[PDB]
Coordinates of C-alpha atoms in Angstrom, one line a residue:
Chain M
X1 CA 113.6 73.2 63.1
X2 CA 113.0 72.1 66.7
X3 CA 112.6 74.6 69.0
X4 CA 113.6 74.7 72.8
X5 CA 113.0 77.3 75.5
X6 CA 115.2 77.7 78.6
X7 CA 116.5 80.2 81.2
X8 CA 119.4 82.9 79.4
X9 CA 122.6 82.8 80.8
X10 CA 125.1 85.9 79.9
X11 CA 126.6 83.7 77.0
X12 CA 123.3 84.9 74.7
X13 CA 123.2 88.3 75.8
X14 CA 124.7 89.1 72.5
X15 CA 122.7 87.8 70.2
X16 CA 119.2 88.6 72.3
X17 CA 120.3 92.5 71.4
X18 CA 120.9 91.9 68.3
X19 CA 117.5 90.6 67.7
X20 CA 116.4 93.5 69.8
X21 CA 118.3 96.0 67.5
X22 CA 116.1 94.8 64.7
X23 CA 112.6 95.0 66.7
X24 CA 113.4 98.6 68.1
X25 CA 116.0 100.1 66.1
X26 CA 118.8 100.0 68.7
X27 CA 120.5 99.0 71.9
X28 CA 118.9 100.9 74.3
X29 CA 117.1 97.9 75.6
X30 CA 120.7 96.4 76.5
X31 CA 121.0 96.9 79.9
X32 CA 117.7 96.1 81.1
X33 CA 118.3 93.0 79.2
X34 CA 121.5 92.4 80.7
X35 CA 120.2 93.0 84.6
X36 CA 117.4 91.0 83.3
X37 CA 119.6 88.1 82.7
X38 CA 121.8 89.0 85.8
X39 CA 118.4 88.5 87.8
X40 CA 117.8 85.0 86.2
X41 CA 114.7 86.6 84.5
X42 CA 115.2 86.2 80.7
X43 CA 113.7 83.3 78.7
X44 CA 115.0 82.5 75.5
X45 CA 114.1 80.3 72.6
X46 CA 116.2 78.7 69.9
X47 CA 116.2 76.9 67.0
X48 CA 119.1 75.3 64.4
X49 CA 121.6 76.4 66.9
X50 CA 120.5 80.3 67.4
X51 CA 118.3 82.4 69.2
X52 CA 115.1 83.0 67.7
X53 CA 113.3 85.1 70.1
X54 CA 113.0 86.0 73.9
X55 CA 111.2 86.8 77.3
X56 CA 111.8 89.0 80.1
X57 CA 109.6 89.5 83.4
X58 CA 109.7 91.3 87.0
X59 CA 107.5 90.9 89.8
X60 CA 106.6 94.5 90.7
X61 CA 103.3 94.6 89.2
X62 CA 100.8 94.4 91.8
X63 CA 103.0 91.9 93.1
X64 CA 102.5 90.0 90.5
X65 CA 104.6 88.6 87.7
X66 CA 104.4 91.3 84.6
X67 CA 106.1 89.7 81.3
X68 CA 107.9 93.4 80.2
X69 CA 109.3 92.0 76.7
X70 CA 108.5 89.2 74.5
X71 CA 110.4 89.7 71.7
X72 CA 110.7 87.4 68.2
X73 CA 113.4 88.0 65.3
X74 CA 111.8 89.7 62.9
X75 CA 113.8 86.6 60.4
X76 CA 111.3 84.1 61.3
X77 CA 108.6 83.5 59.6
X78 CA 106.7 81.2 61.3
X79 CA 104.5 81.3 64.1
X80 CA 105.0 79.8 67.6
X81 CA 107.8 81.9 68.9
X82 CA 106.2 83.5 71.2
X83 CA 103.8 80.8 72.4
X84 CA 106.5 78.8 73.4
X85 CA 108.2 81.9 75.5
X86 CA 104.7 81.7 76.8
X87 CA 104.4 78.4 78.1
X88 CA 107.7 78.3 79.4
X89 CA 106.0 80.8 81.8
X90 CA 102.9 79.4 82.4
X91 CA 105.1 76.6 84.4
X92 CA 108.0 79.1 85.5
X93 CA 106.5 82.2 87.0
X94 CA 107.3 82.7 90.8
X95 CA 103.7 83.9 91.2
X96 CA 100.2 82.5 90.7
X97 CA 99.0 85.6 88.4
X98 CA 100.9 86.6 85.2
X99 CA 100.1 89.9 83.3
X100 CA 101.3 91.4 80.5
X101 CA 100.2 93.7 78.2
X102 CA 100.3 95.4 74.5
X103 CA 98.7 98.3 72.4
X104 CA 95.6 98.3 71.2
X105 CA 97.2 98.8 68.0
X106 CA 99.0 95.4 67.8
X107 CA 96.6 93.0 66.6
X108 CA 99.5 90.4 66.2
X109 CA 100.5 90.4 69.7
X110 CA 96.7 90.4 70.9
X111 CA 96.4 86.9 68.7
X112 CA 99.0 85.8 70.3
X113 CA 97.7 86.2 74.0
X114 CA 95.0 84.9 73.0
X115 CA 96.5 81.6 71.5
X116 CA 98.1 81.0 74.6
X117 CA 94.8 82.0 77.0
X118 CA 95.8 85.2 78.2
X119 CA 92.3 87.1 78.4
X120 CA 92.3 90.7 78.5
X121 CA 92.1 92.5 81.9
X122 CA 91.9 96.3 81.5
X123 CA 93.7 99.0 79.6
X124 CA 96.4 101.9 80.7
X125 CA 96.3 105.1 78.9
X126 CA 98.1 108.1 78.8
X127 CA 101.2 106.3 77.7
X128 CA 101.9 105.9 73.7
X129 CA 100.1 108.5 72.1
X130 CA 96.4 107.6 70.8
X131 CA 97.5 103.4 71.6
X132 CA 96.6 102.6 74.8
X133 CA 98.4 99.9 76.3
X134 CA 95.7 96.0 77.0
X135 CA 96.9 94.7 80.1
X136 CA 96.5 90.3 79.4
X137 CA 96.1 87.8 82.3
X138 CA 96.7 84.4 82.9
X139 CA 97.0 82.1 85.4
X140 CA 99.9 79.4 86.1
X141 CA 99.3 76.1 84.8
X142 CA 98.5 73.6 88.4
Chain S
X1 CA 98.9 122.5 113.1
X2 CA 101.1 123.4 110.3
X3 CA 101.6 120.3 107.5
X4 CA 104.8 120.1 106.1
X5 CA 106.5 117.8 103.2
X6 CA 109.7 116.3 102.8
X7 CA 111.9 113.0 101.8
X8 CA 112.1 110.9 104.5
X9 CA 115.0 109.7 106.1
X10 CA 116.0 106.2 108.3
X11 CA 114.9 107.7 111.4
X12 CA 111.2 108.0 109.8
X13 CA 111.1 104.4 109.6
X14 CA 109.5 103.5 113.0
X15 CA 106.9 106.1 112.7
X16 CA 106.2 105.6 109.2
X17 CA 105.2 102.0 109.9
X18 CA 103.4 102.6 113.1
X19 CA 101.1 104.3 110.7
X20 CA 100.7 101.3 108.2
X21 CA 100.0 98.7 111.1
X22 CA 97.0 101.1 111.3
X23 CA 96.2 100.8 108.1
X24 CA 96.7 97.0 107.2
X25 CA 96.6 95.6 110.6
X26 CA 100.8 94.6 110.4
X27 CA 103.8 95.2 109.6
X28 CA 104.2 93.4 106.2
X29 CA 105.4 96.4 104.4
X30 CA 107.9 97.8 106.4
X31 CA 110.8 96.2 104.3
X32 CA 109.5 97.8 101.4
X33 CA 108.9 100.9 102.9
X34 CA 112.5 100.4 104.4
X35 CA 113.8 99.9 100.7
X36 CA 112.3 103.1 99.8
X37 CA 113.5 105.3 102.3
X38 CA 116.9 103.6 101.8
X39 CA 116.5 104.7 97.5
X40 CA 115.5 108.1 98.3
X41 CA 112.4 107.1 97.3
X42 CA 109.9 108.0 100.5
X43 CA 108.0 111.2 101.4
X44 CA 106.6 112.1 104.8
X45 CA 103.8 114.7 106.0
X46 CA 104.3 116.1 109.2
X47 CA 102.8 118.1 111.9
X48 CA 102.9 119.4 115.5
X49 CA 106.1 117.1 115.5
X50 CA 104.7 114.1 114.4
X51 CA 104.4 112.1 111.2
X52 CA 101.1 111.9 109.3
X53 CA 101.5 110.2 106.4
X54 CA 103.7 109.1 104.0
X55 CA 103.8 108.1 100.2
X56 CA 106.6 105.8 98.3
X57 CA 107.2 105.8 94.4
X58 CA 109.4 104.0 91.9
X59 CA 109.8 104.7 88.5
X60 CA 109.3 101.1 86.9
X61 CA 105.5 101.3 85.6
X62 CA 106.0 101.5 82.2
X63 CA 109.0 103.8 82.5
X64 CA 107.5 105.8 84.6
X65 CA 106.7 107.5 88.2
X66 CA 104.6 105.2 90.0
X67 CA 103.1 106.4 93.3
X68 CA 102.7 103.3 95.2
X69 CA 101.4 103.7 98.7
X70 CA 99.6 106.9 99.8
X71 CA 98.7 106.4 103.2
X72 CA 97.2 108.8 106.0
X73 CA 97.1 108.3 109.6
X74 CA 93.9 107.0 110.5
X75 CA 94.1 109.6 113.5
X76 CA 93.2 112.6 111.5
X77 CA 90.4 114.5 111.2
X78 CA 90.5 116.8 108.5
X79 CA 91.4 116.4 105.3
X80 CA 94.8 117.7 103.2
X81 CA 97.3 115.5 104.2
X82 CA 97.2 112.8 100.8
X83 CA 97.1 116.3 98.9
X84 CA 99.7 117.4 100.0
X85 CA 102.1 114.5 99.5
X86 CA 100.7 114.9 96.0
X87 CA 101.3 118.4 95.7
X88 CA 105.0 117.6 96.5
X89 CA 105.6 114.9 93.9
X90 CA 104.0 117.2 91.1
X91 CA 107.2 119.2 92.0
X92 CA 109.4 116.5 92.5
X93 CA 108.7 113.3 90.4
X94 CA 111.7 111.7 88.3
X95 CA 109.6 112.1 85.7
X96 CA 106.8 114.1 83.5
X97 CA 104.1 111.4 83.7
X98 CA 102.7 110.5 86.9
X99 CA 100.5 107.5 87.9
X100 CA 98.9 105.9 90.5
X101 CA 95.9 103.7 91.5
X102 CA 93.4 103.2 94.0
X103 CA 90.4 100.3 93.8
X104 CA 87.0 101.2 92.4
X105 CA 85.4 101.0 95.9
X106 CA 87.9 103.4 96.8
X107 CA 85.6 107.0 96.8
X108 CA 87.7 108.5 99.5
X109 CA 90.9 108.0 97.2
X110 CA 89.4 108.8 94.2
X111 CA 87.8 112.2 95.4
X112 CA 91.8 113.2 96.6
X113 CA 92.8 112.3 93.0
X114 CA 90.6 114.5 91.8
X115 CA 91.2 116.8 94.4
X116 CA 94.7 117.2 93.1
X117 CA 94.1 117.0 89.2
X118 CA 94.7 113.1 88.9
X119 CA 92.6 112.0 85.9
X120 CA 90.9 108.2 85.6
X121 CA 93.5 106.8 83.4
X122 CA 92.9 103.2 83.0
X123 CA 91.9 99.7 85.0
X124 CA 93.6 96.6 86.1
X125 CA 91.3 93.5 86.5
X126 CA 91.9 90.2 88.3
X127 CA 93.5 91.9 91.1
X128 CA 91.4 92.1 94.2
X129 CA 88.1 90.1 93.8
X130 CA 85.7 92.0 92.5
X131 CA 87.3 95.2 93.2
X132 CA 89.9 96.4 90.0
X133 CA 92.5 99.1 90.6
X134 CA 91.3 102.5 88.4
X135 CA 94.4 103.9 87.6
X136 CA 95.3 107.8 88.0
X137 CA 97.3 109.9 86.1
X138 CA 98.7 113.5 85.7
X139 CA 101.9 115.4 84.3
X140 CA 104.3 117.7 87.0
X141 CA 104.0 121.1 87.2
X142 CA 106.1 122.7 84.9

C-alpha cells in the first residue's frame, strides 16, 4: 500500500506499543514512548490505514540529534519502513548532525543506514555483551 | 588544603560557573549546569573554602551514567581534583556502568581516566573537526 510518514500524536500510542511488544517482548518501552510522543519526538509510518513502524529521537547526544528507536512490525515484509522513518528525518531534525547507532551484530539495520547514507562514525563498547554498539552519521538534507 | 566532595546545591551555582567562563571563555553552560544542580545531578570539589571543580551526569547514554562535564579550575596547581570527583561517582553513580569522554587530543584527560581506572571504551567521529571524542568507561565500586 502507500505509505506516509508524519509526527505521532497520543491517538497511536497504542498501537506503536503494540508493535513494540512484538520487537522486544514487552511494554517496557511504553513510557519512553509515551514522553517521546508528549515531547513531539515520535515519527510514525503507516500504511492501509495502520501503523507499520516508527521513530523516536532526543537531542542530548553531543548536542546533537541521536535517533534512539527505529522500529518496524515484525508483519511486514517488505522493505522501506525504515527508510522512510529516515527521510522524514533527514528534513525534520532540529539539528544539522544526526546520529544513531546499532550492534555490530545487526547486519539488517547496518543495510539500512547505509541505504539511506548514514556512514559509520565510531563504535561504543562495554554495553551489550560481546556486540558493540556502530554509532551512524548523517547530515540534514539543505 | 584539604579537597573535599559533595552534591552541590543552588548556592554553588555562581561559583561553579565562574569556573567554566575559565574554561570556555562564557557562560553558555550555566543553564545546564543550573538544570543539573536543580536534578541533583551536580558534584563539587572544594578546598580552603572555595570551589574547585565540579562534574555533572545524567543517566541517558544508553541507559546509563554519563559523566558529562569534568572541569578543574584553571587556578590549580597540583593535580587530584578531576580524581577525586571520579572517585566520588564510583561510590555514587545511579548506575553500575559508567562512561564518559574526552577528545583524542585530550592527554591531560585521558591520563586522569586512567588515573582512576577508566578504560578506552569506544569513539565518536564527526564531532569536533578532526578531533573524535574516545569514550571512557568503568563499573562502581562495589
Amino acid at each position: 500500500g502507500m505509505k506516509n510518514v508524519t509526527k505521532a500524536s497520543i491517538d497511536d500510542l497504542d498501537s506503536i506499543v503494540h508493535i513494540d511488544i512484538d520487537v522486544i517482548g514487552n511494554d517496557s518501552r511504553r513510557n519512553y514512548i509515551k514522553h517521546s510522543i508528549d515531547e513531539g519526538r515520535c515519527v510514525i509510518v503507516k500504511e492501509d490505514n495502520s501503523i507499520s513502524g516508527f521513530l523516536t529521537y532526543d537531542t542530548n547526544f553531543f548536542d546533537c540529534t541521536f535517533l534512539s528507536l527505529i522500529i518496524v512490525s515484525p508483519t511486514k515484509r517488505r522493505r522501506g519502513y525504515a527508510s522512510s522513518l529516515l527521510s522524514y528525518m533527514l528534513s525534520h531534525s532540529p539539528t544539522q548532525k544526526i546520529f544513531s547507532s546499532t550492534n555490530e551484530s545487526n547486519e539488517s539495520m547496518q543495510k539500512v543506514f547505509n541505504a539511506n547514507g548514514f556512514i559509520r562514525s565510531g563504535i561504543v563498547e562495554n554495553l551489550d555483551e560481546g556486540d558493540p554498539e556502530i554509532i551512524f552519521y548523517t547530515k540534514k538534507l539543505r
